[PDB]
Structure 1
Amino acid sequence: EKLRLLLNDKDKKSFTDEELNLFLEEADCIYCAASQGWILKSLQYENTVGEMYEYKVGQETYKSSSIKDLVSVAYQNADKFKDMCTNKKEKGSFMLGISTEFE
């Protein structure tokens, strides 16, 4: 199932199936749709991990990766998926003939 593959290309439940179907309809190849999904997922880090990357309270301190690093990783994933899709699409160089009638 294409949608299951796309979820496995995006670490599963952050979107709902309607968005995934819309992405698949956006581009025929799954990897371009996955790249677009990754770009859109990079937006959602503003809520998943807010700007507060580090905090200390009581005897506990937790230092999460800042939002810039996470979006950088998301864009890197999107770029890799786009490159893989173009690799699937792009063909090599060619040389062909020419002919025009004459009399």
Structure 2
Amino acid sequence: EKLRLLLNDKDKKSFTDEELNLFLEEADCIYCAASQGWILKSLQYENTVGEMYEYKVGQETYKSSSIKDLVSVAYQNADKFKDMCTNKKEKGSFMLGISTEFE
């Protein structure tokens, strides 16, 4: 199923069901939809990791990769999916005949 394959190509339950259908409608090739969804997922990091990515309380210390690294990883996923779609639709070079009518 295209929806299930797309939810395999991305994290399974971060997105609601209807926007997966929206992305499937927007692009017929599933990998283009995966790239779009990955960029949209990458937008999320401003909420969680943007406002706080490294905190220490008492002796408790926690560090997480900055927003730049995570969005870079998500963008890399998006670009890989886009290149995958291009290679899917790509076709090699061609030499063809040519002919014009004459009397």
TM over 0.5: yes
Unaligned 5+ residue runs, structure 2?
A: none
Partner Cα separation in structure 2 for residue 65 and residue 25 of structure 1: 34
Structure 1 runs of 4+ aligned residues shifted over 3 Å read: none
Distance, in Å, in 1 between the alignment partners of 2:21 and 2:68 is 29
Q: Offset of 1:48 from its aligned partner?
A: 3.2
How far residue 45 of structure 1 moved from its aligned partner, in angstroms, is: 1.2
1:52-73, Cα deviation, whole Å (9 max, x unpaired): 2111001110001110000000
Q: What is the CA RMSD across the aligned residues, in angstroms?
A: 0.9
Looking at structure 1, the residues matched to 48 and 2 of structure 2 have their Cα atoms a distance apart, in angstroms, of 26
Q: TM-score, normalised by structure 2?
A: 0.95
Give, in whole Å, the separation in 2 of the partners of 1:65 and 1:77. Answer: 17
Note if contact 1:32-1:81 (Cα within 8 Å) is conserved in structure 2: yes
Task: Give the CA deviation at 1:10.
Answer: 1.0
With the length of structure 1 as denominator, give the TM-score of the two structures.
Answer: 0.95
CA shift at 1:101, angstroms?
0.7
How far residue 49 of structure 1 moved from its aligned partner, in angstroms, is: 2.4
1:63 aligns with 2:82: no
The 2-side partners of 1:71 and 1:78 are apart by: 10
User: Percent of aligned pairs with the same residue?
Assistant: 100
Q: Which runs of 5+ in 1 are unaligned?
A: none
Alpha-carbon deviation of 1:87? 0.7
